[PDB]
């Protein structure tokens, strides 16, 4: 499961069993981070993140793990947050370059494809290390419909109906499978996204947490934004009360 | 004109198993003459010569830079240079300065080492090669030299007669050009020998 001394120091070195451990160890960093979630609905995409309160001295809304990469595109991150922000900056520049060159909003699949190429590039050399995070990209339009993608440290990207990354990616996925998301409205999905985070959360190992929530669908007119304090708190109450 | 600044006349002729090359001996700046014994023909090997007409600096510069490349050729290659190859070497050298060229139009005259064959050529200031079976001319009195050569040249001339023809062609074409003269030097190239002569040209 690991290789000592020689074959795991550089990303320009293959292990005898055909593995790049530097990528795998960077993949371990995200597995240690708190869970990020996101599932595709009938008319959009919703994001949910558990944010572990390190200290009560931090502001409510600090360490935002939900980003606006473009007006219609939202990013959900898990892993070394410092890397997650640089990739958020790279993704922003890519969506900006596309409009500058072609004159319209970047297709989400292509945005994911492009950022994935940049991630992957950091897995081949001794000169640099792989990115220590994983991130999701969600969008909605009337033409392309609801779309959801996720990129990991190796540079791999796939489409999703439901997706989760971090501590309890397994605990989340089995709870996501339960949902008929192909038929559900995004107003409903928020409630369910909120409860899965609460179920996933370990309240006896980790101290406490905040719930981050994102929009991107028809109700937002195709623009990615934050779920209002009103709608979040209804979904937070729903999460606490169906936990029994 | 830029070529007009220094003047000069270089000419090459072909014969029966031989070649001849001739140049004026003048070094002068527009209004005045400075030197009477200026060199324009340079040996690029035993039996192979290059004559250079045009701007005196570029005449000297090209001769020195061709020597640089020729010596490296003769050292890297195990042989002495064939006339066609020198032509192409001068062509490349000159064309490299396509948009800032050396102001000289070279004439190559020699016998092929090994094979015996006579070879003459003249070139652009940007390296266009001209190969003929008779004569090539370069300088400020091209028109005068053309007029002589066309009227004077014959297909199979022996060394004795070839020298007389290339001389008379040079002597009289130079006497119509105000920027060429102060003596004429003639090299006759044979297999057995090389004959060098300075003529009793007009010193006006």
């Amino acid at each position: 499961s690991s290789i000592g001394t020689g074959y795991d120091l550089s990303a320009s070195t293959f292990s005898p069993d055909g593995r790049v451990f530097q990528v795998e160890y960077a993949m371990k960093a995200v597995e240690n981070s708190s869970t990020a979630i996101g599932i595709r609905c009938k008319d959009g995409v919703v994001f949910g993140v558990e944010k572990l309160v390190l200290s009560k001295l931090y502001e409510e809304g600090s360490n935002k793990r939900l980003f606006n990469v473009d007006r219609h595109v939202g990013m959900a991150v898990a892993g070394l947050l410092a890397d997650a922000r640089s990739l958020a900056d790279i993704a922003r520049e890519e969506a900006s370059n596309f409009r500058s060159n072609f004159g319209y909003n970047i297709p989400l699949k292509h945005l994911a494809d492009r950022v994935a190429m940049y991630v992957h590039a950091y897995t081949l050399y001794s000169a640099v290390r792989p990115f220590g995070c994983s991130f999701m990209l969600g969008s909605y339009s009337a033409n392309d419909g609801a779309q959801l993608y996720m990129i990991d440290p190796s540079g791999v990207s796939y489409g999703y109906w439901g997706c989760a990354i971090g501590k309890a990616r397994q605990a989340a996925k089995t709870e996501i499978e339960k949902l008929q998301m192909k038929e559900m409205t995004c107003r409903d999905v928020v409630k369910e996204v909120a409860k899965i985070i609460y179920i996933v959360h370990d309240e006896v190992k980790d101290k406490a947490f905040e719930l981050e929530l994102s929009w991107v669908g028809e109700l937002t007119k195709g623009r990615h934004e934050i779920v209002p304090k009103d709608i979040r708190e209804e979904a937070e109450k729903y999460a606490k009360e169906s936990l029994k | 004109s830029i070529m007009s600044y220094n003047g000069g006349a270089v000419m090459a002729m072909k014969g029966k198993n031989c070649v001849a090359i001739a140049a004026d001996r003048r070094f002068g700046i527009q209004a005045q003459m400075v030197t009477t014994d200026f060199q324009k023909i340079f040996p690029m090997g035993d039996r192979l010569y290059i004559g250079l007409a045009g701007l005196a600096t570029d005449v000297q510069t090209v001769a020195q830079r061709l020597k640089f490349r020729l010596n490296l050729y003769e050292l890297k290659e195990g042989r002495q240079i064939k006339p066609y190859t020198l032509m192409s070497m001068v062509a490349n050298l000159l064309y490299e300065k396509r948009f800032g060229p050396y102001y000289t139009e070279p004439v190559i005259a020699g016998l092929d080492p090994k094979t015996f064959k006579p070879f003459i050529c003249s070139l652009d200031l940007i390296g266009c090669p001209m190969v003929t079976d008779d004569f090539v001319v370069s300088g400020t009195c091209s028109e005068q030299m053309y007029g002589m050569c066309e009227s004077l040249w014959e297909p199979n001339m022996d060394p004795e007669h070839l020298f007389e023809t290339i001389s008379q062609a040079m002597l009289n074409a130079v006497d119509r050009d105000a920027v060429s003269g102060m003596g004429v030097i003639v090299h006759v190239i044979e297999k057995d020998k090389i004959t060098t002569r300075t003529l009793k040209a007009r010193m006006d």
């Binding site: - | 039996r47 652009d124 007669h161 020298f163 007389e164 001389s167 090389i194 009793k200």
Partner: protein, 219 residues
């Protein structure tokens, strides 16, 4: 220069005169303007002499290298695109007006490429200072699907017209026929002017030239 190109039933044919001028004086009476690119692709060059020489040799150098790497019969459309991208990069400072003709798996093809890098594909064309004379003959007598010999004669007439009407054109008309079978480079196909014969002998008996210095180097 006068250079011309022609498409016929079984292939293409290229034409050229043999005159080179330095200023307004005929430097070369027998210079070659039909240039080798591939065994079945040829190019006629008009304009700055050294420029048409280097561009054409450079193209041929890149075409042999391309055929070596692909193991295939070179394409004339490849020659044309290589040429024009090279010439466009130099913004017309390389004064090379080219008529490229050859045979592909896609049949007989004829292109013309100007120094600034513009190209056009056509059944017949003419470039150089004598181009006016040649197109006149072509527009007059060109037909689609001509016989080789009918096509060879018209081309000779087109170049001949250029030679006789243009002061920057003379010497012999060089022809190059390219067929789906092979290429025949008919150098000095037709030769209009002849004056080599004369009746004026201007010899000098050894010793008429006055000599001051003599030196002999034994070899």
């Amino acid at each position: 220069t006068t250079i011309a190109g022609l498409v016929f039933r079984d292939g293409v044919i290229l034409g050229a005169d043999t005159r080179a001028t330095n200023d307004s004086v005929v430097a070369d009476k027998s210079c070659e303007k039909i240039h080798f690119i591939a065994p079945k692709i040829y190019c006629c060059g008009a304009g700055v002499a050294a420029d048409t020489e280097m561009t054409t040799r450079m193209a041929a150098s890149k075409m042999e290298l391309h055929a070596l790497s692909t193991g295939r019969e070179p394409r004339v459309a490849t020659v044309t695109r290589i040429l024009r991208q090279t010439l466009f990069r130099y913004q017309g400072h390389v004064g090379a007006s080219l008529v490229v003709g050859g045979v592909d798996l896609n049949g007989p093809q004829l292109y013309e490429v100007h120094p600034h890098g513009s190209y056009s594909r056509l059944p017949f064309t003419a470039l150089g200072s004598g181009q006016g004379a040649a197109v006149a003959l072509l527009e007059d007598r060109f037909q689609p699907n001509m016989t080789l010999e009918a096509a060879q004669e018209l081309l000779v007439e087109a170049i001949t017209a250029g030679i006789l009407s243009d002061l920057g054109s003379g010497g012999n008309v060089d022809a190059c026929v390219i067929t789906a079978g092979g290429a025949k480079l008919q150098r000095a196909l037709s030769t209009p002017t002849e004056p080599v014969q004369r009746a004026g002998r201007y010899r000098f008996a050894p010793g008429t030239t006055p000599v001051l210095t003599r030196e002999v180097r034994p070899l």
